Design a protein around this ligand. Structure first.
Ligand code: CL
Ligand code: CL
Ligand code: CL
Ligand code: K
Ligand code: MG
Ligand code: MG
Ligand code: MG
Ligand code: MG
Ligand code: MG
Ligand code: MG
Ligand code: MG
Ligand code: MG
Ligand code: MG
Ligand code: MG
Ligand code: MG
Ligand code: MG
Ligand code: MG
Ligand code: NA
Ligand code: NA
Ligand code: NA
Ligand code: NA
Ligand code: NA
Ligand code: SR
Ligand code: SR
Ligand code: SR
Ligand code: SR
Ligand code: SR
Ligand code: SR
Ligand code: SR
Ligand code: SR
Ligand code: SR
Ligand code: SR
Ligand code: SR
Ligand code: SR
Ligand code: SR
Ligand code: SR
Ligand code: SR
Ligand code: SR
Ligand code: SR
Ligand code: SR
Ligand code: SR
Ligand code: SR
Ligand code: SR
Lengths: 142, 337, 172, 132, 156
RNA sequence: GGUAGCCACGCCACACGGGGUAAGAGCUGAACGCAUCUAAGCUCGAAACCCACUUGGAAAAGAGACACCGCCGAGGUCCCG
RNA sequence: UAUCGACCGAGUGGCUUGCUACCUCGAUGUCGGUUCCCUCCAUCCUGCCCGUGCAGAAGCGGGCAAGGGUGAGGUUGUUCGCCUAUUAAAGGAGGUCGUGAGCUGGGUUUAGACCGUCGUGAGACAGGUCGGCUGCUAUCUACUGGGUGUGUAGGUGUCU
RNA sequence: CACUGUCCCAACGUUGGGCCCGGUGAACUGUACAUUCCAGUGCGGAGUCUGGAGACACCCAGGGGGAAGCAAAGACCCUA
RNA sequence: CUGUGUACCAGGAGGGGAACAACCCAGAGAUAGGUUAAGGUCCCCAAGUGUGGAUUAAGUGUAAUCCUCUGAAGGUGGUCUCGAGCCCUAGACAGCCGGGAGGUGAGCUUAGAAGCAGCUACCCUCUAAGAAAAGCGUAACAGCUUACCGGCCGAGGUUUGA
């Protein structure tokens, strides 16, 4: 393992998309980012509708293949890839200098990026990456 | 309007390629319930004969009557459990943590792996127990190997090695059970795991048949009537519609047929014993004579004679066990004829 | 808007994030009152439900939160109790509590017993053709009761002619 | 239906001509359908020892000919397997005509009958002269 | 034929009968209903106001009219009310029923052009508005969305 | 007539149960003092969904883990039956 | 308002038919069938439900639901449809009206010929009838199976 | 009527090919580029355009889904 | 399909519109610096995770134009905002408790009909109320009710329009 990250982000209770946006922005700036506690990051809206979207992505496919992740590990890292020009040298470099983890394998407590936090006391319609993964059938390793 | 019809063959046993390991690799084990105990065993296929049995199904009209039953004779000499490998639960599933070995090894295990000359059975056992304390211990499995030297009908001497999970009571009592089995020398028998009349799943690499076409390999029809005479006897109608302009992997095509791994559910163990009671006059065709530890499995077992097969306590039995069936007769009639 | 619930004298209330626990002589109950922008707290010897919002949706939950809490006070003091009776016409129905579930045997002549697991510290005491469901948690009690009546549900045949079943006779 | 007590390799199909082992006035019967059968695409619905089949009379008295009736297969040439492994086969393929209640329509049965048929249509078996 | 084919004012005004012939008669039975012997001297005067300019075939005019008046027999065959469908189907409509060749159509019907906000129906009654229900059924059989409008009633 | 072998027309094997839902049955419950299956919350509930089961799968570029042997020799290739 | 349901009005589909003449006349082979693969739901069966003019049994109607199934035969080239016996039911539709560098060639639609009708005649027919041909060694791509290399970076064995 | 693998439903076998090796040794076809797939777009029927997805290279064998495949300046239809 | 006027494509680059003859900016010698246009400023991708405020919970929406971007008639105590009439601390609206009473079972009709089959009338006592009975209910009664009145409670309620 061992990922000498310049930045350790804490996705716990944070809008996944909004975190992913800033992380990509930084990887392209040369920063090595480690996103932690993916299982606990969140995405707002109706759980039923949200899950239909992620279930559809799992059903899609064919011989050429449309591999779509089910664990918060991949759901997140994929989300980030969608915000990167990964088929290009510069974009693949950034993406590769970014890793997402379940829980926190580091000693430091990651930092919370501004604007990315969700206030549980003011919101009820949102879901946890971990919950999507379980509904999608993933083996709850975390 | 073209009648409906199920597709030819199952899409669940592919890709239909050659097996990677001639030795079967179970992908599931029984539930932890009874006392601790190794969850599997192994032997070599010899052939078939039939047997006369006293029906023992409490719900059968024939309960108590003679009933002939086909049987596959499996030579099952004692194996050696040479190590205790422990797994730890991590964010990426289970991973091998460490192994605990013995000193006494079969004289010819040196034909497959590099037998240990300097090992530390306690440094390892300690690491395992520390792990168990932390609560990071995933199941415990025993590295297991056969002794084909005890089987004269099998040309090989080079053992077949396979991991077999240990299941049972508490992980602690279980770990101790495992460690004792290994420490000894490892040796254990079919008796130790199975009792006649129980249901076992048998895994094995089926007989190889090289390349074969769609008809034999997928069960597609042969061209019929006039269509069978114009130049196409056993070639499917079409590889697919115009659009999508590509051949889907689901259309039955020629290729490797046979030599695949198959796990055959619920096989009734008719009788465990040892000696030459089930041998056949003239010898089992293309095998030899049986006279040692053996098992009679009801029905068929994947693979040709001499192939290593694996036993495992049935994981999804449909019937309750009726232990020790009464075997009134065991054919010894030559198989040649 | 803000509401203040004076807590009964035999009772005690305590908060823990979004969970509330009420304890009286009849036992105790813990619930979760999680809604956007509604703060539920224990100030001295009173429970406060307040929010800066006043929209229909917020007001709705405030009223629901109140009843839930007054019901808890009542549960741990006077407790909750539902009464039930077993009415059968041809086949003698046997209703019994076995373990943590009630078992109804020989219903409408069936050979297989119907059963439903009881919810929480709800106690079900059967005496003759009468049943009585009681406990501090009304939710847990209410369900158990309903669960038993639902257990003798019948869809296949005409209910007007087939009425065998355990019915709720008294609601608190 | 009640278990036969033997495994059967259907020796007949829709269209097969068989003997009418009784005295109803029907000499030859043509198999049209197999009670309770559902095959698969391109497969000729098959019948064997023990099945109840719908039949049309091909040979016999004018009064019986052309009538569509139910019958029971009593004998067949293709072998059947008995619990003890032994195979059993007959000299011909035969069926006994039977009514709505599965009672033989004719008074007497001609020729042997498989004991297995008795485990279903007892009234037919209890009109048999020889039960093998 | 569907209303789809003629509801829009998408053709020039075609009403001159001195040049058009074979126009089908009208399916509209009457234009004056109720006690038409009496005058509009009533307390309440409600009216059905079309909310979009459209062409309404006499086909729909008669269905809506019946639907409303027939129901206004919740007041009685000779009740105390007035009812007037004030529009007449002057527009002659055709259908090209040789493909697009010489396709001028043949007279197949007539429709009434009604502009957004015009009132198509007007009822006169005493505080006895079973008429508001009569128009709910009336507006139910004409192309446009409509709004029922009480013209002289502070008798809430 | 028929051995081996290959075969089917022959023979063997192919759950039970969990979890989450739909329609639906309900509980508690307010907006709306009542009522209300719903708005927050909850108990149930489909051959369907997820798991369970089988098959593939270190080229999974985060390109994996464990144990031992070996680095002048472990192991492998050619060769031979 | 169990159920049936006219008039009139509003739509969705792109399965029928028509319209148009945008694409293709230095060629995109036609109908039907067949074979083989994927799919759609407006569900025929199977699972779970609601209502009834629901006692029961059985119907009738409605809801969720596309996992699986939906077969054999007689006339006809038929598609369609009519008919028979079975069946849980023997649903419909899309894929160049899927599928001829896969098959068939019965229908359509060349060259031969007859009949009826029409035509002075040659000859014609949106009529009928008998006969009447089916090319090619796969370059790329696609997939079914099998190998050799490089990467990860000495080997054996077991795994994830 | 008789008979039969036409079919239910396919199996085994025989001879010659096929496959590997020595030798001999063409043709068809070729604007270029080209590892594609799902959608969309576009002269409304795209390997090459757009957006995603997938994609380590090369080789052997295969049956032919696509290249509106190759073959012949459509013979139908209209126009001169 | 066929007219007409006009600008465009054809024969028009470059910037934008995912791609995209004619939609938007724009009409263009080379080269260079600068500032804008259309259109954009969370990331892919240059520029805001900008400010004050409101609404929406459907992932509605993030779709100028369009063969290309659908969404209709009909409905909606989903929710926000604005207004009008009326009732109300002399206690409204709802809920719960109590009272709902005599003449009289009105007359007629009819075997009978007594609040309640039908027709007719629809009166007066006690009183804080109580119909010649609005809805069930019985064969008819009875019984449940309810109109109406009092109590407890205590703050807005109700009707309608946009
Ligand atoms: Cl895929
Ligand atoms: Cl919320
Ligand atoms: Cl049949
Ligand atoms: K052409
Ligand atoms: Mg043999
Ligand atoms: Mg023998
Ligand atoms: Mg067929
Ligand atoms: Mg041309
Ligand atoms: Mg549906
Ligand atoms: Mg019924
Ligand atoms: Mg076609
Ligand atoms: Mg083709
Ligand atoms: Mg061809
Ligand atoms: Mg060819
Ligand atoms: Mg030009
Ligand atoms: Mg930027
Ligand atoms: Mg949308
Ligand atoms: Na996928
Ligand atoms: Na076809
Ligand atoms: Na289905
Ligand atoms: Na037919
Ligand atoms: Na075509
Ligand atoms: Sr087809
Ligand atoms: Sr596996
Ligand atoms: Sr041919
Ligand atoms: Sr294509
Ligand atoms: Sr026009
Ligand atoms: Sr024409
Ligand atoms: Sr309308
Ligand atoms: Sr529900
Ligand atoms: Sr590797
Ligand atoms: Sr649907
Ligand atoms: Sr059904
Ligand atoms: Sr026809
Ligand atoms: Sr032909
Ligand atoms: Sr490289
Ligand atoms: Sr080939
Ligand atoms: Sr930024
Ligand atoms: Sr912002
Ligand atoms: Sr704002
Ligand atoms: Sr288009
Ligand atoms: Sr539009
Ligand atoms: Sr609308």
């Amino acid at each position: 393992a061992e990922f000498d990250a310049d930045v350790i982000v804490d996705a716990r209770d944070c809008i996944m998309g909004r975190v992913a946006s800033q992380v990509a922005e930084q990887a392209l700036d040369g920063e090595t980012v480690a996103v932690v506690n993916a299982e606990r990051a969140v995405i707002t809206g109706r759980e039923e509708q949200i899950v239909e979207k992620y279930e559809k992505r799992v059903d899609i496919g064919n011989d050429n293949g449309y591999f779509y992740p089910k664990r918060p590990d991949g759901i997140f890292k994929r989300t980030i890839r969608g915000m990167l020009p990964h088929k290009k040298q510069r974009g693949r470099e950034a993406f590769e200098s970014v890793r997402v983890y379940l829980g926190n394998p580091y000693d430091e407590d990651g930092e919370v990026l501004d604007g990315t936090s969700l206030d549980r006391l003011s919101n009820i319609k949102f879901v946890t990456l971990g919950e999507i993964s379980e509904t999608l059938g993933a083996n709850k390793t975390w | 309007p073209q009648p409906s019809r199920p597709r030819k063959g199952s899409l669940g046993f592919g890709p239909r390629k050659r097996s990677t390991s001639e030795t079967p690799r179970f992908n599931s084990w029984p539930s932890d319930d009874g006392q601790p105990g190794v969850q599997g065993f192994a032997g070599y296929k010899a052939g078939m004969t039939h047997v006369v049995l006293v029906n023992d199904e409490p719900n059968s009209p024939r309960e108590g009557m003679e009933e002939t039953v086909p049987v596959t004779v499996i030579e099952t000499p004692p194996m050696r459990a040479v190590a205790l490998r422990a797994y730890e639960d991590t964010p990426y599933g289970q991973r091998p943590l460490t192994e605990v070995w013995t000193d006494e090894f079969h004289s010819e295990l040196d034909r497959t792996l590099d037998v240990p000359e300097d090992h530390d059975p306690d440094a390892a056992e300690e690491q395992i127990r520390d792990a168990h304390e932390a609560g990071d211990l995933g199941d415990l499995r025993l590295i297991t190997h056969t002794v084909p030297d005890a089987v004269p009908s099998v040309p090989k001497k080079k053992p077949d090695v396979m991991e077999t999970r240990v299941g049972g009571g508490s992980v602690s009592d279980r770990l101790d059970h495992a460690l004792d089995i290994v420490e000894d020398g490892g040796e254990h028998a079919m008796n130790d795991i199975f009792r006649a009349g129980e249901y076992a799943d048998v895994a094995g690499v089926t007989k190889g048949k090289g390349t074969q076409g769609p008809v034999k390999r997928w069960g597609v029809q042969k061209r019929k009537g006039k269509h069978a005479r114009q130049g196409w006897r056993r070639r499917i109608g079409n590889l697919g519609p115009w659009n999508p302009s590509r051949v889907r992997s689901t259309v039955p095509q020629q290729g490797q047929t046979g030599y695949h791994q198959r796990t055959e559910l619920n096989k009734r163990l008719i009788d465990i014993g040892e000696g030459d009671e089930p041998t056949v006059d003239g010898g089992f065709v293309n095998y030899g004579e049986v006279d040692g530890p053996y098992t009679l499995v009801k029905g068929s077992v994947p693979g040709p004679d001499k192939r290593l097969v694996r036993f495992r306590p049935a994981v999804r039995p449909n019937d309750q066990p009726r232990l020790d069936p009464e075997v009134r007769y065991v054919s010894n009639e030559s198989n040649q004829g | 808007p803000r509401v203040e619930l004076e807590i009964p004298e035999d009772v005690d209330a305590e908060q823990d994030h979004l969970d509330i626990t009420v304890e009286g002589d009849n036992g105790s109950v813990t619930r979760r009152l999680w809604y956007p922008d509604i703060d539920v707290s224990v100030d001295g010897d009173t429970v406060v439900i307040e929010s800066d919002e006043d929209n229909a949706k917020t007001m709705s939950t405030i009223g629901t939160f109140q009843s839930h809490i007054e019901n808890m006070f009542h549960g741990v003091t006077e407790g909750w109790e539902y009464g039930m009776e077993v009415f059968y016409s041809h086949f003698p129905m046997q209703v019994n509590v076995e373990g943590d579930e009630v078992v109804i045997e020989n219903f409408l002549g069936e050979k297989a017993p119907r059963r439903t697991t009881i919810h929480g510290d709800t106690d079900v005491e059967i005496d003759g053709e009468e049943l009585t469901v009681s406990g501090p948690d009304i939710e847990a009690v209410g369900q158990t009761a309903a669960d038993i009546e639902q257990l003798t549900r019948i869809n296949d045949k005409d209910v007007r002619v087939f009425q065998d079943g355990v019915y709720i006779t008294r609601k608190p | 239906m009640e278990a036969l007590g033997a495994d059967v390799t259907q020796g007949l199909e829709k269209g097969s001509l068989i003997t009418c082992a009784d005295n109803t006035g029907a000499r030859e019967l043509k198999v049209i359908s197999v009670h309770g059968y559902s095959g698969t695409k391109n497969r000729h619905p098959k019948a064997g020892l023990g099945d109840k089949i719908t039949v049309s009379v091909t040979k016999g008295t004018p009064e019986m000919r052309r009538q569509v009736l139910e019958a029971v297969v009593v004998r067949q040439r293709k072998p059947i397997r008995r619990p003890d492994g032994t195979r059993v086969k007959f000299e011909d393929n035969a069926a006994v005509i039977v009514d709505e209640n599965e009672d033989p329509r004719g008074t007497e049965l001609k020729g042997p009958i498989a004991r297995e048929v008795a485990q279903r249509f007892g009234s037919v078996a209890s009109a048999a002269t020889m039960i093998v | 034929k569907p209303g789809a084919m003629y509801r829009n004012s998408s053709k020039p005004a075609y009403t001159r009968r001195e040049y058009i012939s074979g126009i089908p008669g009208k399916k509209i039975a009457q234009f004056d209903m109720g006690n038409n012997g009496a005058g509009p001297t009533y307390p309440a005067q409600v009216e059905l106001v079309v909310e979009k300019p459209v062409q309404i075939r006499h086909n729909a005019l008669e269905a809506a009219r019946v639907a409303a008046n027939r129901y206004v027999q919740n007041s009685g065959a000779a009740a105390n009310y007035k009812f007037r469908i004030r529009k007449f189907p002057f527009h002659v409509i055709r259908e090209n029923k040789d493909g697009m060749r010489a396709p001028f159509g043949k007279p197949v019907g007539t429709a009434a052009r009604v502009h957004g906000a015009n009132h198509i129906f007007i009822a006169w009654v005493n505080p006895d508005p079973n008429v508001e229900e009569a128009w709910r059924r009336a507006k139910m059989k004409v192309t446009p969305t409509i709004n029922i409008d009480s013209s002289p009633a502070g008798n809430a």
